[PDB]
Amino acid sequence: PFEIEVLLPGELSPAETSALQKCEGKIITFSTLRHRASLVDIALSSYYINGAPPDTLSLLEAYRMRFAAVITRVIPGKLLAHAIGVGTPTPGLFIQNTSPVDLCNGDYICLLPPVFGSADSIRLDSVGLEIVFPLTIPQTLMREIIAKVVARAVERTAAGAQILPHEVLRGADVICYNGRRYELETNLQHRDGSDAAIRTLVLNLMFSINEGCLLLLALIPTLLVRFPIYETISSWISTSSRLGDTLGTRAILRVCVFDGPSTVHPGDRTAVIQV
């Protein structure tokens, strides 16, 4: 069995080491798998690009390249974790639910950067770094989560772009799973992440679809009863493919409960099998 040991820092305040004890079964991403690592790898500092803090589009990409690990148990002077990588036979692997939606048996686990609300995370002011944990959602729920968030941001620009808004709606968007409705983003105010992290993602998406239903229109004009015209095609195929693999969906874990309760609520921990 392959395991990682994270060196706990010295001169850590008792309030910080206590809250670190709470996050037992959470997921940690590593850049290079090694037996001994430091806190700078897990912290957000090693995660940002181009100096500025990371973005949703970059958050999704790094989750594929980086390897993931699961914390097992914390020690007043030591921190251990297990890899979910090549072949290691992790015994008794349990994870903690970080998403607001429930999980049932036979649901495959996946990962997602925090989009709904402000991400919770432990913050160590003494050393000066913080550790952000990824979100854990089932398979059949992510594809509509991404679509609803992106579609919401486009609605905001349209209301500002158009001279008059086309307001009239159906109410408010809601996500229902196991008979529980989430009802994300009630108000119109509090544009916390409207254009803070999902800003660049809506741009590449607002473009790739635009040249999509514009190229076919300008290539075959019989649908509705100086110019390269070839490098635009190769540029479209490259982007639309490069936007596809990063906006992918790969199951990472599968919950398998034996003698425990079927459903789990946000905050509970359950045993999972390595897919």
Partner 1 sequence: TTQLIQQVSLTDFFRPDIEHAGSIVLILRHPSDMIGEANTLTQAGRDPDVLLEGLRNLFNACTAPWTVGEGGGLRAYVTSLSFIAACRAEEYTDKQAADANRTAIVSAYGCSRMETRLIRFSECLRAMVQCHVFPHRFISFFGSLLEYTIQDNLCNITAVAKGPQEAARTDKTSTRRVTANIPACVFWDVDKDLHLSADGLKHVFLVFVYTQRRQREGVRLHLALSQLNEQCFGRGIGFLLGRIRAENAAWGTEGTRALPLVQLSNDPTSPRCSIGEITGVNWNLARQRLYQWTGDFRGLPTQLSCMYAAYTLIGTIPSESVRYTRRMERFGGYNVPTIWLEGVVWGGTNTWNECYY
**Pair 177, 101: CB distance under 8 Å:** yes
Q: Which does 154 bind (CB under 5 to 8 A by kind): partner 1, a second copy, none?
A: a second copy
| 119, 38 contact by CB (below 8 A) | no
How far apart are CB 7 and partner 1 at their closest, in Å?
16
Task: Verify binding: residue 155, a second copy, rule CB under 8 A.
Answer: yes
243 binds a second copy (CB under 8 A): yes
Partner from a second copy, partner 1, none contacting 157, C-beta within 5 to 8 A by type: a second copy
Confirm if 36 and 93 have CB atoms less than 8 A apart.
Answer: no
Name the pairing type of β-strands 78-83 and 27-30. unpaired
Q: Which residues contact 192 (CB under 8 A, 6 or more apart)?
A: 117, 118
Please say whether the beta carbons of 69 and 27 come within 8 A.
yes
Which residues of the shown chain bind partner 1 in the complex (CB under 8 A)? 2, 32-35, 64-65, 85-87, 105-106, 108, 139-140, 174, 176-181, 203, 207-211, 213-214, 217-218, 221-227, 229-231, 235, 238-239, 245-246, 249-251, 254, 256-259, 261-263, 273, 275
Closest CB 151 distance from a second copy, rounded Å: 4
Nearer to a second copy, 65 or 179 (CB): 65
Buried/exposed 1-33: b ≥16 CB within 10 Å, e otherwise = eeebebeebeebeeebbeebeebebbbbbbeee
Contacts 24+ apart (CB under 8 A), 118-122: 118/192, 122/16, 122/19, 122/20, 122/23
The residue (of 130 and 173) whose beta carbon lies closer to a second copy is 173
Burial of residue 100 (number of CB atoms within 10 Å: 0-12, 13-18, 19+) = middle
Partner in contact with 165, chosen from a second copy, partner 1, none, beta carbon below 5 to 8 Å by kind: none
State which of residues 89, 128, 179, 267 lies at the interface with a second copy (CB under 8 A): 89
- Distance of closest approach, residue 103 Cβ to a second copy, in angstroms: 13
Beta 67-75 vs 94-96: how paired, if at all? Answer: unpaired
Report if residue 38 touches a second copy, rule: CB under 8 A: no
| Among the listed residues 200, 199, 210, the one whose alpha carbon sits nearest the alpha carbon of residue 236 | 210
**Residue 33 or residue 119: which is nearer to a second copy going by CB?**
33
Which of partner 1, a second copy, none interacts with 50 (beta carbon under 5 to 8 A by kind)? Answer: none
| Nearer CB in complex with partner 1: 178/187 | 178
Task: Specify the stretch interacting with a second copy by CB under 8 A; choose among 49-57, 119-127, 128-136, 235-243.
Answer: 235-243
CA dist 274 → 84, 94, 153, 252 (Å): 7, 10, 36, 8
When the beta carbons of 8 and 243 are compared against a second copy, the nearer one is 243
Q: Does 224 bind a second copy (CB under 8 A)?
A: no
Residue 10 CA to its chain's centroid (Å): 31
Beta carbon of residue 215, minimum distance to a second copy (angstroms, whole number): 6
Tell me if 51 contacts a second copy by CB under 8 A. no
What is the distance, to the nearest Å, from the Cα of residue 258 to the centroid of all Cα atoms in its chain?
28
